[model samples]
Target: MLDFSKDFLFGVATASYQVEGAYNEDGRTMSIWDTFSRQDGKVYKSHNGDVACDHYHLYKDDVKMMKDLGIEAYRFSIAWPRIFPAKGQYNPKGMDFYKRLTDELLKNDIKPFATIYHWDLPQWADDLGGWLNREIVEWYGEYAEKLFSELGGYIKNWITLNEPWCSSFLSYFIGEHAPGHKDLGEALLVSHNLLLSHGKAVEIFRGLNLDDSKIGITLNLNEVFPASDSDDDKVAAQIADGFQNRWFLDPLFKGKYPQDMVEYFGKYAKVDFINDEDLKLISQKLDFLGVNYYTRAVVQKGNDGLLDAVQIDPGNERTEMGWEIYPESLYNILMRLKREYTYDMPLYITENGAAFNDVVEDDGRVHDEKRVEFLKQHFKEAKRFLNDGGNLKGYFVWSLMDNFEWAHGYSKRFGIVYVDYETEKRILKDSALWYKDLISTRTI
Candidate 1:
């Protein structure tokens, strides 16, 4: 069995829009998600996070469950809409909810890791062009400053932004998420603004200089493989890597955009959005890096017109999301980050888990063996990375309980703790029990 030390954190994560379903309660305003999910064909079945798990009303019980499960830390996000509700407005009630949540976590001896923004941009911001507008850098900095001033002491681990790639490319370029738009130029501009906002928040965080606190950003990264040995496929894979991985990594670490991606994207989109002084802010030193890993990509040359890479099935076991199971890539990715980008900096698997079709059995138990094995294999690879002296610090499973999944809505269940929407009941899947064992025993 692979073992973890006492200092290694064992936790689970959730986002505000996904779990906190107080959409309009207590000074909360509509988020972009509130608008996007209302569109006829945007989200699956027109499903929205209108009342997801009612975690807003039941967080005490959730925290109790987390304490019972031997959880060490909880990674969650703050809703921008809840805090601001409108431009330049601060709502104490919205801040009160998080203060209460943090107090509950501390009372139960569970550390709280707060992500300042995980999508859920206020509707007012979207009206002002959101991330597409450079002015959002100042807007975001104000929000971060207020958040730090209010909750800085209690929440020590702060993540400025979760998955800037998703915030920019997936939402804008792919047109799959909130404020959906399908222009390459718009997407590139959104990305630059997102990075700038992150830099702005990091600057604010440094100014406060809260004692015993750390700040960082999370990126969803994947290892890419070419479908064939042909030069065409190899080149496609490289571009795909630049598209997904290096594009963000180079900016955050190397203080510049990946030149290859800049050239490739220039063919289809305007590339003049970047400013020279922007990289200086984007490349600010961070205390940690949060990585969200789920699966690897196998790509071949294709006619996508953008990356020229299309994913191919590797014929392995797959998650409900159709993502191939490839645990070894986790070790490879951690190693690569250490060797090339992060060096000796602390890294956390901020999110990693699989969604499987779940059914409550006659015995009232959800026996999710596949999820157990999925996490087992992945955790083993993580241990392998640690064995090789990688500065890996912690792992927080993708979710603690099933709630609203954007686009897919409540259809996809990635949580070890199963949630029954009808009754808001939570049942611990076998995977959760297995995780509890690992947490209590400090072994995998």
Candidate 2:
């Protein structure tokens, strides 16, 4: 038997660009995603959020769905492109949409948790070098101030950014996401500016001093492992950890970058743009840290350049994205943050779920057993972590319904609620049903 505290929040998550499809209506302009997907051979099947689930116009039914699920919270992102269509310009028309959405959420008695930015950089900002330019710090701070001043009255729980690594390194170094570039130097610069932006936003939030309101950043952190028992393999894992885990954690919590990593990545990326007081701003006190955990990495010493490490297979069951599914790593990471980094700090699993090939049967019901199992296993890990006195306060499944999944477009489905893209119909999958019961019962 497994049980969670009455106050433990069980919620579902979504991003504005992923679900809301009113891209051109009401004075909104193109985001980086809009321009990127327009190019040939960019997003899968040239699929974009032009008419995605239509959540912008249909948020009432969406909130009703959450209310029906008995969800205690709903985590969603505000489109930076929507709020700021042009550089240094603020539009009330775009803000009206979010105001309506939040008002409906409150009316339904669902707590609204807001993620200020989730990769929907306005095209004007992109032209100004987007996250690559240091100007983004001031730009993001301005956008966030507007959001808080307008929406803070109702939405008190604020997440400054969702996965800085994804916005910077993955999109820049990996060249797999929007505003795609493969330059290591550019990625490093973006990484620094993103943290600066978060710090600035938090500074502004504190200035307003909304009582009982919370602010934090979300990081997609991984627990790295050694593939072999050899010291060489152990060193490889440590370096890998530095790249994935400590790169953001160190600066966010310890007010410094991992010295080993700074020295290691120096060969590939430039960090001279980082200054003395930058870390001080990035490491501001947080009410909570939102962690998006999915899988762990098993690395070993290799001939790879820059880091001299390679991620080898761990012989574990894999997700549709080819990620190894190891739920124990979730518990391990929560314990690590508690013991090593942020002692006794409140942690929330902001995003955790798997993408699987889902199909709806003739019974008009969609069944995704693997995703259900994936979430259940991770929840058990969360339960164990809690039983061991972990300070995890909430767990939000990666998505409520499927939308345009990043570069994969509609090819990947990460939502518990099955969405028929052809008809814009939403059918709750078995996992959605399972989660509904779990949240209502606070047990599994």
Candidate 3:
């Protein structure tokens, strides 16, 4: 058995738009995802979170599931639209849902780790250009200040943004997610504004200065590899690293963008959106950092307009998300954070889980052994990192239930507890049981 200290945290996660089903309930307004999914051919089978896991009305039941699993924490997101349904609008009803949820978690002895923004930008904000508008820094500060004032009494751990890379590049440049667009300049601007908003919120959070409250930002980071040993391929790999990893890491920790990327993307996009003061705001001292890791990328040189590098499949064992499963990269990234970005600050694996074609069995149970193996291998790697003196404090699975899988919609299942979308039932898969044992014994 691989063991951990008593303080080591074990938990599951969920997002508001992904699990909470009361989309139009109680003074809530439209979010970008709600509008984006309404468009033609955006989400799979045109499915949206209109009525997802119904966690909004059933959170107590969900909390009981966590209690059953012996979980120590729950990392969940707050829907910004729910908080601010309209510009400068206040909704006490929105605070009620979260207060009840937080109370339930505390009653069960579970830590409620709150992520303030999880890509559910209010449509009102989107109308004003959302992240593209620098005014978002002020809008976000107001929203965050509301949350801190309302929930700061109970929720002390706050993650300002969840995966800003996907928020900017995936939605703006790649054109796969909400408010889809295909512009490099827009993506870069949105990236900058997102960080700017983060700094602004952190500034508000710092002003609140709750000695008990801890704050940070969550970044989805990847470990990159060159497709070959050739000089050009190695160069391509570094470019990929700059595009995905260092682009955000450097600004947050190093107080600047990677200069190589600045000069590289300049051919396709303008860096004029960035200014001298922006980096200092983005690189404000953080109490901790949250990292979301799933797979590694292998890069080859190509004439792509964006990065001059193309991600090629490494033919490794892959998850249902078409992502290659590479658990060892988890250790590599943590080590890199120590030797490269973060000197000695604590880090949390805020999101790390895979999607698989999980199915319910004849015995009325879901059996997903692949996910169990996935967690085992990843936990083993984390154990190795801990033994190597990595200050990794916690591990939260990507999801607590199989709700909505974003653009893939209901097609992908990533939860330890399988949800029957039709019956609105929750069945614990074998992986869930395995995790229970691991959490109970504190071992892999």
Candidate 4:
């Protein structure tokens, strides 16, 4: 038997670049993703999110879908380019779009959890070196302040940034994501500047005297597992952990980057970029921590390569995205965060779900049993974590509907609701109905 508090929130998550198409509509400018998706060999099958799900035109109907699903909240991001088409210029039409969307969610009694950035940096900002430039700290801080002024009264919960690791390291260091670059020094500099910008945003929000508002940053954390008990394997796992988990966590929580990371990227990084005063601002006590957990990494020593850690594929049931379905890792990560990181701050499962190869039956319903089972197992682990005294306050499915999936594009479907790309038809899968029942009854 599982018992959750009445205040526990359950919802679905989406991003502007990933869902709201209309890439160049209503004064919207191109984002880094818009450019990256155009370059050769950047995305799968040369697919881009030019008009993903057409959510820009159909968000009202989508809210009705959420209403049918009995969701308590909706966690979504507002595209910076959509809000600010040009540097230091405000776009009223863009602001009106979100205002109406927020009103629709509220009209249906669904709380709106808005994220300010989901890695859709405006092309203008990227031309200015994106996150690599330290000036972005103030630039983003001003943007946050402006958003808080406009939408803060209606939306209380705000996520400052989503998955800075992917934004900084993957996009810059590995060149696997948008704004692709492959420079170690640029990656290190971008990582630090992203954190600094987050700190500045938090400080600005706190100074706004908004009593009901809360601000936090979201990080994509992976459970790094050692391949075996061998010393080298264990060291490899530790290094992976340092690079992914501690790289951002330690700085935001403890006001400094991890010593291991500093030593590892010593030649490419310097501590001079972070000042004593910046530490105080960066370590501002968070109202909550948004954690996006997908899967664990089985790491072993690697041959000489970019990073000395190699990811050994753990043969397991996989999703359409070919990601291992390891629900137990969610519990492990929750326990680790409680024991090793900040214990007092409450946590929200900001993003967790899977992409399954779904098929629509003759009756126009998609039977995604794999995704249903995935959510069930993960939800059970979430309940176990809560029972073990972890302060898990909220859970938002990775997506509400099938839309753009970044580099993988439309090939990967992580949403409980199926979106027919051709017809722009939105159909709720059985999993979405099951989630609705869970929210309505507070039972699995």
Q: Please, what are the lDDT tens digits per residue for candidate 4 over residues 119-153?
A: 89999998997898888887798788888999986
| lDDT of candidate 2 over 288-343, digit per residue (tens) | 99999999988889986776677798687998888999999999999999999989
Give stretches of model 3 more than 4 Å off. Answer: none
RMSD of model 1 against the true structure: 1.0
- Judged by whole-model lDDT over C-alpha atoms, candidate 4 comes out at 0.87
Q: How do the residues 99-213 of candidate 1 rate in per-residue lDDT, one tens digit apiece?
A: 9999999999888999999999999999998898889999999999999999987899999899988888899989998899988889898999999999999998998889999
**lDDT rank order:** 1, 3, 2, 4
Query: Clashes in model 2: which pairs?
Result: none
How high is each candidate's TM-score?
A: 0.99, 0.98, 0.98, 0.97
Q: Poorest 10 consecutive residues of model 2 by lDDT?
A: 267-276
Task: Give me candidate 2's TM-score against the actual structure.
Answer: 0.98
Best-performing candidate as measured by lDDT = 1
**Model 4 clashing residue pairs (backbone):** none
Evaluate residue 50 in candidate 3 and report its C-alpha lDDT on the 0 to 100 scale: 94
Worst 10 residues of 1 by lDDT: 303-312
Rank the models by TM-score, top first.
Answer: 1, 3, 2, 4
